[model samples]
Target: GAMGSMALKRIHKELNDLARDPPAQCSAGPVGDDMFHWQATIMGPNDSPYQGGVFFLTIHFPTDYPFKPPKVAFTTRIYHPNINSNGSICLDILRSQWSPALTISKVLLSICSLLCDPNPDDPLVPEIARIYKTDREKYNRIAREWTQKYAM
Candidate 1:
């Protein structure tokens, strides 16, 4: 099979699976262009201090994908240890630790975990992390405030 065909197959399979089992926190689907890019909508984790918040994200698949990993980043701007104002998420899977075995579903799960517990050690927003570490309640409050204000 040709590379494009292979790419389509993978995208379709992933889309279908995600549609069926849709992550507890989000929904994702291919956005045409033969799946070169996709969009996702995620509900902030329930009772997770971000409940009721909805966030959007975009995933761009490189022509080389799987072997190179998709370029995934938050389209929503929120106060989080891993995500920055520019919407870049500092997660290893989306970067260094990425492997073909990882799927969009898994990526969403990791993102959910990030909300439940951020890894300030690898923070995209160092100031946010500093606030999170030094004043957790303030961080959570600010985070929630940001969520309510923007993530509705």
Candidate 2:
């Protein structure tokens, strides 16, 4: 019950904070009354292949919110070394390095950073990372194309 109460209020507090002080290039809100389920939007960063694109996401807050990291994934398709076709992201703060104090907006900001500077060495998609490392032009071309085609 202690865990539940903390999660219940913390999640609601986050919702209001996001609404009043939304993250730059991002917005997130509960799907409805279900505090555990939410949706988010992330506008692509400037100068990146994904520029002019708008990405959507799904964020699921587990029951143990203060301890367990929220489950977040992209609904919009993306081409990135750390983002798989499944929309899975290989982010440190979103995974093993996650902390209870990190807010949803902070994580969303991190996602924006990931788009700007992809981590080819710690890739979630090896094929994409290989192209990103050896054939950067091709990687950029494909990423831009996908962004325009599906996300722009």
Candidate 3:
């Protein structure tokens, strides 16, 4: 039998839930059959600058599971104020806002929303934020170019 624990049990449930009614524009599952490590893909939202791009991500669950949020990082480069060149995302839910009630499906959904609507006020890249606020068109063009260059 597989490993058994409170965390494992909950992860199994979350995986089953994800398999049933998946979140839009995103898909995720364990990597290399390792339940604690996962890989995910997010198709850029339609009508957004990231449209037509497919972003890759990694997720590593902690031993404590629901008590601690997974570590998520983009393996693909994305040009956005909230996402730095290093693929580190600056999202509230990933930080202090995390709750045990939240599931991976919700996390993916939040990431999808972030791709469509960036928060310039709280950004991972200051320069990108400045450009996003000062030159909206330029920001969109650059973001689109990055999506084409890296995400495709």
**21-111 in candidate 1: lDDT tens per residue?**
7677588877766577899888988776688989999888777666777887778878898898878888888888999888888888888
lDDT of 2 by residue, 57-147 (tens): 9999988896888999999999999998889999999889989999898899899988988999999999999999999999999999999
Poorly placed runs, candidate 1 (over 4 Å) = none
* Number of backbone clashes in candidate 2: 0
User: Quick one: ranking by lDDT, best first?
Assistant: 2, 3, 1
In terms of TM-score, which candidate is stronger, 1 or 2? 2
Q: Rate the local accuracy (lDDT) of all candidates.
A: 0.84, 0.92, 0.90
TM value for model 1? 0.93
TM-score of candidate 2 to 2 decimals: 0.95
Global lDDT of model 3 = 0.90
What tens-digit string does per-residue lDDT give for candidate 3 at 30-91? 98777899999999899888999999999999998898899999999999999877788998
Candidate 2 or 3, higher lDDT? 2
